[PDB]
Amino acid sequence: KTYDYLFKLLLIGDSGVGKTCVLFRFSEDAFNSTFISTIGIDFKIRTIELDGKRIKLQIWDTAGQERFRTITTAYYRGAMGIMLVYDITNEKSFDNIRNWIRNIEEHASADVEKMILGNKCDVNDKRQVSKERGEKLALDYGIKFMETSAKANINVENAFFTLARDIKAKMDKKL
Amino acid sequence: GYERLKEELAKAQRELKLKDEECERLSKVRDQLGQELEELTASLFEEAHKMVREANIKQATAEKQLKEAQGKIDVL
Amino acid sequence: GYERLKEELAKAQRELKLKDEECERLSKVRDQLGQELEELTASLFEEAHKMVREANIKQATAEKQLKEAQGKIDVL
Ligand SMILES: Nc1nc2c(ncn2[C@@H]2O[C@H](COP(=O)(O)OP(=O)(O)O)[C@@H](O)[C@H]2O)c(=O)[nH]1
């Protein structure tokens, strides 16, 4: 041996949307240390169970630097589910979510599973992006959307388990 | 140019086909190399964190044990 | 009729270039993946140490209190 599946996932988005905490909360680390700041890549493993089976999730978190342009394509191209992540505290993050959707469409694969993750939903008092307007983006592009707090610990575990179910249901279809 | 266009559109068509065939090969080996880099870098991160955690795990025990004596001196 | 030939290599001309440009890229990949993998691996290593270092630095200073700050308890 167990596991019995391996999903490769990717986190992408504007810097400081909190991509990296969103991870660190899912993978369950006790600590803050990461290489995202300095390198622009970090990585985490977590196996979960879904309808009984072991599912190993490899989660890459990418931060765009052009420094490693080639390598990070390799992650896009090889990714099974990618989470697009904005800050509801910040518009352009949300505006860019389209831009990323480009990359994903342009650099990544033709059937990839996709999920818009509206992060920091906890801090409503600094809230510039309406959720309603969040869902509409998603629905336009026919992708799932979800509001999320790496810090209040809201919907992060669900966001992943949901994306993992979506990956598996697709693969079980090719029995 | 009936024989010129019926000839060249065989060579030109082949070029696109030759490359089509050449593309899959080029893109096959780019995906193959990318997996191998995935699993390589997967291991390096996994260790790098593994190492760094243990350097922090001890730092906590030492500092933890110091709060165990540091509060009783500041209590009095 | 006489415009159907112009519809082919207006299209083809734009097609050939596409693939020919695709490969130019797809060929440099194996070297970039390596020439990146390296940089990464270094960066990883470098940072990996820095983190472990800091951790230890603080294991020291938070143990010199157990020998010098406990001596302050032994001197009071
Ligand atoms: N309030 C709030 N702050 C967050 C959240 N996620 C991250 N942050 C903070 O926002 C900043 C960006 O998060 P970070 O992990 O660097 O994401 P990244 O820069 O996109 O990889 C940091 O200062 C985090 O402390 C969140 O969900 N809510």
Side-chain angles (χ1 to χ4, degrees), chain A residues 2-27 30-53 55-68 70-169 171-175, chain B residues 1 10-12 19 22-29 31 33-62 69 71, chain C residues 1 9-10 12 21 23-62 65 69 71:
Chain A
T2 187
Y3 71 88
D4 19 290
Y5 290 91
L6 185 127
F7 301 157
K8 297 155 64 177
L9 271 21
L10 182 44
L11 295 202
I12 120 215
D14 278 4
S15 125
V17 149
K19 270 196 274 74
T20 297
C21 306
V22 124
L23 206 200
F24 274 38
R25 185 125 214 149
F26 180 57
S27 279
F31 297 111
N32 59 113
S33 13
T34 140
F35 310 100
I36 190 65
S37 285
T38 60
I39 295 177
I41 297 198
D42 204 334
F43 176 75
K44 227 90 187 158
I45 263 101
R46 154 157 175 181
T47 310
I48 66 199
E49 168 190 324
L50 259 179
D51 305 346
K53 312 296 230 354
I55 320 315
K56 182 163 294 193
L57 300 180
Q58 279 159 18
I59 307 159
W60 285 101
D61 159 356
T62 180
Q65 19 197 106
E66 74 307 63
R67 191 182 181 197
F68 309 128
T70 277
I71 289 180
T72 73
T73 290
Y75 299 140
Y76 272 73
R77 182 136 74 162
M80 261 159 288
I82 155 68
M83 298 276 202
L84 311 91
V85 177
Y86 69 99
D87 181 349
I88 75 204
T89 274
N90 172 318
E91 256 272 342
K92 57 187 146 35
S93 52
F94 189 65
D95 292 316
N96 299 320
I97 289 316
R98 293 146 176 291
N99 282 347
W100 297 117
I101 283 181
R102 250 229 87 188
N103 274 29
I104 287 169
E105 158 197 344
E106 175 258 52
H107 276 355
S109 325
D111 88 307
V112 73
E113 222 76 23
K114 282 182 294 331
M115 189 163 151
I116 306 189
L117 231 44
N119 200 33
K120 322 208 197 168
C121 70
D122 53 89
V123 25
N124 268 36
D125 61 296
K126 300 170 79 165
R127 178 166 222 133
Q128 300 280 352
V129 178
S130 90
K131 167 129 103 72
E132 162 167 307
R133 225 182 104 210
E135 329 199 271
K136 177 66 156 47
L137 220 198
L139 187 27
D140 282 344
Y141 289 110
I143 109 177
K144 291 214 178 172
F145 149 95
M146 224 166 245
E147 276 209 344
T148 256
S149 75
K151 317 231 298 203
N153 179 31
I154 304 193
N155 221 250
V156 245
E157 172 145 25
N158 197 241
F160 284 105
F161 270 72
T162 283
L163 210 215
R165 294 203 196 78
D166 287 16
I167 290 178
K168 176 173 174 297
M171 289 211 163
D172 292 353
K173 212 120 290 167
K174 82 202 294 305
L175 13 272
Chain B
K11 286 193 212 177
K19 287 201 173 174
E22 221 219 308
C23 243
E24 248 36 34
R25 154 174 357 275
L26 274 271
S27 176
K28 222 267 215 188
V29 318
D31 299 342
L33 286 165
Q35 304 153 29
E36 300 167 355
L37 189 141
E38 221 121 49
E39 338 206 50
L40 256 37
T41 55
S43 342
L44 280 177
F45 279 90
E46 278 252 298
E47 192 65 32
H49 286 312
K50 191 99 167 195
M51 284 160 28
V52 154
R53 171 154 56 269
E54 296 166 5
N56 302 318
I57 276 179
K58 275 126 63 168
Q59 186 189 221
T61 42
Chain C
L9 275 66
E21 293 159 23
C23 317
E24 277 208 57
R25 320 241 214 294
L26 294 180
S27 65
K28 309 202 211 299
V29 171
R30 337 176 25 121
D31 293 345
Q32 285 160 327
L33 258 27
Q35 211 53 64
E36 270 157 42
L37 204 196
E38 277 164 43
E39 183 164 37
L40 173 35
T41 293
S43 295
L44 225 343
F45 182 52
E46 211 158 5
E47 242 56 39
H49 182 221
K50 253 171 149 67
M51 270 142 222
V52 193
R53 189 151 64 183
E54 284 170 299
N56 312 329
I57 278 179
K58 301 216 163 191
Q59 204 179 179
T61 48
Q65 328 308 256

